[PDB]
Design a protein around this ligand. Structure first.
Ligand code: SF4
Ligand code: SF4
Ligand code: SF4
Length: 262
């Protein structure tokens, strides 16, 4: 799996299906939109249907290697009812490709059973904070069940559900990755605590990614390739760490060295 280790990243391939529009939370740096050509995390060039995603994976698996397929669509992959239809239709069409996902962890406590039934191998959870005094200044609102949270309670609900979901996915038998965005000034001296609690829950690999201030933030400075390495090596002594994150789009297909983007 190219998203793990660091060597297959230039040799193994993956597919992203833009099959998860609309999210259930609001991060202080989200853009999404269909900006055609842009290497943003949530910048899909064109949304697709579950069957169109099947056709896309089928048309790309022959002219490209492809080791995994992943639903890292614009919104939360658990927030869209098309991700599960995609994985169900793909479980019996190409059972050879590993099935990955990029979630926020909020809808993991109820959908861990469904992720296990769909044959999911790996799920990465975007954990950006665990101390409420830090996470209250990263998120705006969280819509859970049938109610919307917006203050410190929003982060409390989000963190509780995401951590319980990490534990549930680890107990069910699914390797979970932890993406954490290094925002200089908020969670810079906090990634080690995130690593402690996430490893206590059951994380295998952690992917520290630099902040891209292409969001609701007043363009904070990007964490220097020195501080991103200082925190990275300070965390490596608690949990294995990934070190080749190109911040892929939501429509990338192929090997992440010569990938396409619709
Ligand atoms: S989710 Fe993140 S890691 Fe898993 S496949 Fe899609 S991109 Fe690679
Ligand atoms: S999770 Fe992805 S989509 Fe939902 S808000 Fe944070 S960034 Fe925007
Ligand atoms: S996002 Fe980071 S981890 Fe997911 S694929 Fe692009 S690089 Fe590998």
């Amino acid at each position: 799996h190219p998203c793990f280790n660091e060597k297959l990243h230039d040799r193994v391939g993956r597919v992203h299906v833009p099959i998860a529009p609309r999210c259930n939370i609001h991060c202080k740096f989200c853009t999404r939109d269909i900006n055609e050509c842009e290497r943003r995390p949530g910048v899909t060039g064109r949304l697709m249907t579950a069957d169109d995603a099947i056709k896309h994976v089928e048309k790309v698996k022959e002219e490209m290697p492809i080791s995994v397929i992943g639903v890292a669509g614009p919104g939360d992959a658990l927030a869209n009812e098309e991700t599960f239809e995609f994985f169900k239709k793909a479980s019996k069409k190409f059972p050879d490709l590993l099935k990955c996902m990029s979630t926020n962890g909020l809808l993991l406590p109820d959908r861990a059973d469904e992720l296990a039934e769909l044959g999911i191998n790996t799920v990465t959870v975007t954990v950006n904070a665990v101390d409420p005094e830090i996470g209250e200044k990263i998120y705006s609102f969280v819509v859970y069940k049938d109610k919307v949270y917006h203050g410190r309670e929003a982060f409390e609900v989000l963190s509780r559900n995401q951590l319980e979901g990490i534990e549930k996915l680890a107990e069910r038998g699914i390797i979970v990755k932890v993406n954490s965005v290094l925002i200089p000034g908020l969670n810079d001296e906090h990634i080690v605590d995130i690593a402690r609690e996430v490893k206590k829950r059951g994380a295998s690999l952690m992917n520290i990614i630099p902040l891209i201030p292409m969001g609701e933030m007043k363009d904070y400075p990007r964490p220097t390739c020195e501080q991103i390495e200082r925190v990275r090596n300070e965390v490596e002594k608690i949990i294995p760490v990934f070190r080749a994150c190109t911040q892929c789009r939501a429509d990338a297909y192929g090997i992440p060295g010569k990938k396409e983007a619709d």
